[PDB]
Design a protein around this ligand. Sequence first.
Ligand SMILES: [Cl-]
Ligand SMILES: [Mg+2]
Lengths: 111, 250, 235, 231, 243, 241, 244, 240, 195
Amino acid sequence: QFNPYGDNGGTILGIAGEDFAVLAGDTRNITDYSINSRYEPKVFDCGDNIVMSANGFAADGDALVKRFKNSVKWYHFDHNDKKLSINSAARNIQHLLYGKRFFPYYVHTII
Amino acid sequence: MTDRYSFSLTTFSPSGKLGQIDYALTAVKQGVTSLGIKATNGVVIATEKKSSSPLAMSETLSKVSLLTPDIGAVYSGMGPDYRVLVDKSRKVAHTSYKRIYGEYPPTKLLVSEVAKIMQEATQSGGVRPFGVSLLIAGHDEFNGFSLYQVDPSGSYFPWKATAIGKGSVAAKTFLEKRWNDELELEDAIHIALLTLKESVEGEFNGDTIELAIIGDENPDLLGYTGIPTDKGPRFRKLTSQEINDRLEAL
Amino acid sequence: DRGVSTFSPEGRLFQVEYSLEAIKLGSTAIGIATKEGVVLGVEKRATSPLLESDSIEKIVEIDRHIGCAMSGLTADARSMIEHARTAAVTHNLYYDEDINVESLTQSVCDLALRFGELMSRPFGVALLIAGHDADDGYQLFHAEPSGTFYRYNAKAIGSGSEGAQAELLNEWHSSLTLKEAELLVLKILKQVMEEKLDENNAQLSCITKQDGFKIYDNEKTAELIKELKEKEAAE
Amino acid sequence: NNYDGDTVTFSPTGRLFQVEYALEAIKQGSVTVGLRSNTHAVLVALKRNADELSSYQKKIIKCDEHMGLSLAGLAPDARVLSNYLRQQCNYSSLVFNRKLAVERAGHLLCDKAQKNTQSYGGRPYGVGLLIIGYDKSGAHLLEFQPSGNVTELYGTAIGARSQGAKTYLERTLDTFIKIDGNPDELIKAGVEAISQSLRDESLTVDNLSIAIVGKDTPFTIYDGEAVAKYI
Amino acid sequence: TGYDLSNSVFSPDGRNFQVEYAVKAVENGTTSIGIKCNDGVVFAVEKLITSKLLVPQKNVKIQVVDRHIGCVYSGLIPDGRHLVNRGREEAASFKKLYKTPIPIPAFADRLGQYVQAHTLYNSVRPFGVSTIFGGVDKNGAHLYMLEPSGSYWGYKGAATGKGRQSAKAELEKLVDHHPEGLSAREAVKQAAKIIYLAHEDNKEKDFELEISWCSLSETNGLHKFVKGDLLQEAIDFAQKEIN
Amino acid sequence: GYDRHITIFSPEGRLYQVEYAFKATNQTNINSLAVRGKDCTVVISQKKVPDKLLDPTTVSYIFCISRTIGMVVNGPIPDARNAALRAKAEAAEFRYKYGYDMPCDVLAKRMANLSQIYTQRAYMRPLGVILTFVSVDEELGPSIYKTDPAGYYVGYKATATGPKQQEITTNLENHFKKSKIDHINEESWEKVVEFAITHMIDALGTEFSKNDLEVGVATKDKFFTLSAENIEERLVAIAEQ
Amino acid sequence: GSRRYDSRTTIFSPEGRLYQVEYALESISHAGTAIGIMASDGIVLAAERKVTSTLLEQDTSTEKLYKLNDKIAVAVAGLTADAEILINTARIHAQNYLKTYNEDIPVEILVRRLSDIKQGYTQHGGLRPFGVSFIYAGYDDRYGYQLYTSNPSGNYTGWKAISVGANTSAAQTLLQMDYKDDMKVDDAIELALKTLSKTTDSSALTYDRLEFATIRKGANDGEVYQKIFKPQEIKDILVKTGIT
Amino acid sequence: GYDRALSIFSPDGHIFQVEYALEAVKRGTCAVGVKGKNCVVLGCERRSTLKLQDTRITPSKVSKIDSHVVLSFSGLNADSRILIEKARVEAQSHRLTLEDPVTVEYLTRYVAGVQQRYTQSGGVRPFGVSTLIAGFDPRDDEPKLYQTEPSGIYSSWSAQTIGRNSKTVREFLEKNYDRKEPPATVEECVKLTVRSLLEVVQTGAKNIEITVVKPDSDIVALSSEEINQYVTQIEQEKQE
Amino acid sequence: MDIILGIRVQDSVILASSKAVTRGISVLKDSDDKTRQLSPHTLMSFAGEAGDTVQFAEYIQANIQLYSIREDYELSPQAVSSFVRQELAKSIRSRRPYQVNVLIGGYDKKKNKPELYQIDYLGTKVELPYGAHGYSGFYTFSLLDHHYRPDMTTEEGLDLLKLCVQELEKRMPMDFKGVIVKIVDKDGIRQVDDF
Ligand SMILES: [Cl-]
Ligand SMILES: [Mg+2]
């Protein structure tokens, strides 16, 4: 039977300071016991000083990042180029994820 | 695109008339004469075969049609409208009756279904009424023989005998003088031929006249043997030769 | 007859132009924007003395930071307010923030042209949408059934609009206080109203950053009416 | 006369009057100008107010980082069409990772407007659009009419008294086309162009609206004190 | 009367006046032609230069369907684009199901049935274009012309627009003088001449010439635009003949 | 008077749109004729190609509906081709659903029913065409069945259609009065085609070249149209007698 | 488009009337008269057939009086074809109620729903209204014997005695004159026939131009019986009251 | 589906179909609502061109929407049934989700919204009905009286009338109703309501219906004799 | 949910229903009223799947109350029971069926007789002198077969009911936290507070 999910491995890490924040992630991409790429980035600048990573099943991860990046674009179009605050981005991402509650994005997301 | 005509094309005028129904009846008046006579042991329905051209084969155009083995129909008015009504009438006898009860509908109920179809063309969106009047003759076990008229409005009436179309006024008067409650089927056929000669102008023979009966069961027309309860259709269309035989002793 | 979405030879939509005439028959509504807040006022106009005037609801809350006044076929405004409230709350659910006043107005105006052969005709009511947000501060918008909205420093709509607007042209300046604006709405309403203005046939409201959208009591407005009469007699 | 009740009806001379009446709404609209060189494309628009208490109706809308338009006529119709362009530009990026060609943008707008001129119940769009952009084949300027007709030009103008600016640009063609690698000069030419369509009114700080896109410049709009430089 | 106010209504003559009114819109449009040749077809069109501000070569009017069919039309330009969009859909589904590219006669009927459908109901308007189109298939070259009524025929040569009569007369001479056949490269030159001769009926604004062609030998059975040296050569041939 | 614009009854019980669709039938100014032999059914029609720029091979009003059924149309070509495509689709579906070739008369009825619907339903106009279907039916033999915009249909011994139809009709009537039979008593289809052309010449009073005619022939298990040279061969045979 | 040919069947006049409803009532006023009279021990339904022909089959005929269920019947005035559409809907509705609650449908509930259907055709859908007026005659254990009438507007009202169709004005005056509350069924039968005999457009009232029916508790103990009169039975009741 | 826009604007800014629906209301029998200090009374005219009526079974003019709210109307009778049914369904739906019966204001707001929807929906005509909705909110003793009309507007009234000759009875109520002192008792409120109808009706026999609503779902309809006593008493005081 | 009983005597119907609501290893409530008044003289008790029970009960209640307002009339217990049966008969062939079993106790005012109907989630209706749903019946039916008489008084019915609760409290595995008892008679519905 067809299994729509896979595991692309890797790991990510976010730490916050007083006037800064970092979002780190390794560049290795795998399936089973093979390496697919030694350099495949999964931490992305999404605009408005928001960095994002969706680690787990890379296809779902790329899809989510792609949709959020697009969400930021339309937030500008619809609300007079207003900056998307990190708290508002977080709430928006909740709805993106929960929208597929019964066929989930197989990723842990950090922004 | 799409049918934007979702509104009624037949509406009440200030005087209370339904224009399109009236105008449909006018179309029936222009139509060729047809009639029906009920006897004690049968029913006869008849009409003239108005040929459009002598090159045309009038055998290929059937004005009298079998609906069920024991029910037949004839009309006056618009031929194409009649043709599609016969298609629909044949189908509804199966879908809304035979496929449910395993037997053919009684005359009155099949008539009722045809009347419903004609009523809906009077009220539904984006359609005109049917431009025909039907005469439906038939037999069933619990009602015996019966004859009905169906008008463009969807109204139907049971008749001992009647006529519709071109010369219906004169034909009805002729039938009133000749009809009694003791008529045998052969006597009714004789009167049908007499009544029709008055309205026909040109040739009057078995090739220009179309005539069918509802009478005794016809085992020879069944197509198979072995089932005692199945005895054959009561509807029979008279042949060209059978009509001419009766025109000599006229 | 003729199509509902038909253009006139002058390049205007018949039905939209006709709905603008209905709005001219409506009761007067005035709005004034200041740096201390936005004031919204309306003429109630009871058709009979037996009618309990406090049931006349022509000023309405959309959210805590957005209020609304109406003029014209006021029954048509119910579904517009219902949409506005849902849009405002829904945005807060999706983004954990207050929605911009302009974005709210644009969402309401999107409904306007959704008519034809969607609803069967345009709305027969104009709206004054007043509110505050962090980006653009205190704002006043005039929303029409054409789907168009203008921002205004001050605006009057309804039967007494063209006369009241000319008066607002002279009286408005960029340094008006909230109290000054309140009196100004009362003054201009009293001028264009048929019956004599009092606390029962007129209603005031405002929106401030601190306290949000508030409809005033009949007791509070009555004192502002008394304060207004005294000041006009004082010179 | 008897043939202007709806868009589905031709006149005896082969005219579509509802489309012509939609065209008339553009003529009543405030003037806007478009022009380009080989490196940049510029929109200049005169904004209109209701009265001195009101704001000035915004004429220019951004569609993508590399594309946008100016409007003249029914503003809500411009909102519908610009929203469609935003989606089409966006579909091209998400699916093909490809910036939508300004020419295809024109073809898409043409076909969307056309469908509204051949069916019962609908109506033509009541707005004209000037689309500028910078893609893989350089700078571009398009003119959209709600009849469906889209046209690529070096320069043009639409709205009330647009004929003045259109004549000026026709004279200045050889000059402004070769303003390469100089944004401020290409704008100056557009501001001088729109000035040929003014009557009794002049260009003020909250009246003028300018937009620009080019080789190393995203589509950006200038209003308020940012256009004081050009008066 | 009132028989002309609604599409799909028969007049007492048996005519659909709305379609005849759409033909008037076509007659108002610019001139376009089609020439059938030895092993292919050639298309050409008149582009009126309304202003100096029009970018030359950049408002292309001739359209390709699939990879082997060319289409040109006169009248309401948006209506023509709608028809080509449908033509592209029709050709795509044919190739999807049957593998082979759509034959020209088959393609002709797809457009014909679609245009004819827009004369059957009052809820749609007839097409305001006459479309000249054709190409090369397994049975050789074919040229067609389709009208607002849905009527179409095969042609040796075809013309429509404001200068159709001038162009038709010039086309008839070629048919008479070349019974054995005209070559592809010759037809391109002749197409230029005929557009220039047909421009006499639209001579206020000067114009821009646009040509395209399909040929079994010259273009390998695919639709291509005529550009550069071959275009200028065809322009010069036309310029020499008017003087 | 909107009762003349759509298919609703007039006060005198008439459908004017149907009547005006009949007048569209003659818009092409072409006459057609159909006769039956012993083994075959022949249909002929005039072919007028006025424009010199037209490709004459593409100008046709005869259609091959199925392998066994042919159809000639009297009326404008757009409506003609509309009818043809539908008939082809209906005949194909019939074969798939019921396992045998659609008879000529059954297709005629089906197309007539469709035409009837347009006379009753408002949103659909009638087609301005008269359809003549021909075949050699495996049960009924040589067959001619004809349809019109009213939804009427009937079988024919022979028939004619067009502006000068009445002249052709009486010409055929007078022949069948003389011969005393329902068909052309001839063995080969070649001579039945010759009969058809001969009697059209007499009725219309015009001479025909090879390019002035269009001929369709139905035999057992195939219907086919003739080329210009097939007709020329036929014209030569008539002239040499 | 098709706007051109729309009659707009569901609109108001400037005076606030519904054109199509008013014109449908005008149609009904030419239909054969039908009378309903409610007594303390039963209900009478009497109706006049529309100008009969001598060759009409009278015994196997139904034009005016229809059975909805065992406890409820209707008298029709208007288009018969329209009435049969509504009658079949009413018959189905009664069976739905019986299936749901295991009790015979109360008369008013059936009347309301049929009247609600008529109302719908006047407010939406753009179709012509049903050209029919009903007299409902029925019994249930809540209100006992009941007479109702409905018309194309979808408005219904209850009655002690009522007429529909032709000459209602004259018929209602005559009923209003001779009717009293303590009346019996046999007296009501006589009043019904006497009224038709005086209001008829025919020369003389005969058995072949009438349909007749009673709803009595004249069965055996606490149960209701519907009697649709046969031709010979109408002939006898016409002699018994001395009309012929 | 039937799509036609029947309710549309005219050049002068009027929606004629809505305005013609008001004419249907003007044709309807008169209805009046008066609220006292502790009650609301709904009075209704019944035309007397209909004798031989059966008043047991004939639809009553005042309808219970719930046990605590009532609705009377003027205009097309058939139309009113559709509004009453919808209102009754919404009443039960409100109890189901909110676990509390409707307020009179809420029920009125719903009915008014339905009427408004039929003024800008395709294929439908407006309701030819104006309503008077009266009752008491749950656990509240303050009387409530509201009015709705075809356009969809609604409002609260101390006393109001609708239907034919309503302008005459409104005139009467405007001078006979004191806002400072409403009818203190049930008797006083019924009498003022009957008086107002007697300005328009004809005979005080079987022409007037009266329904009294008191707090906590206390609704009762008066009989002929009970109403006739008010009619008899008023006429004797009049002869002065 | 779990225990619901019913007894029809001479002049009344008595319904007893358990007070416990248990989820997992925790009794979340011990005062739950597993009943809804459908009309003044009709009461319905219920037991089954969590959520489904109350949702179904309140849905039926709303429908009967709607009927009462529309017709200004109270449906007979027989009529109400048939309506309920049909709803459950529809439900059983739905995508997700209501898993609810009910008892309907009513007093028919037209007949002046008490009536008790037992209906399961499949839509299986029976009129009975005494009824039960779930495992309760396995004890109470035999007990009532012995001690029940058709001419008993309401007081005799309550004593007969005490005998059933005592037996269940002795032999049932689960603690059902006693019962709420309600009586349906000519004067309507009332609750016994001390049981
Ligand atoms: Cl068929
Ligand atoms: Mg059970």
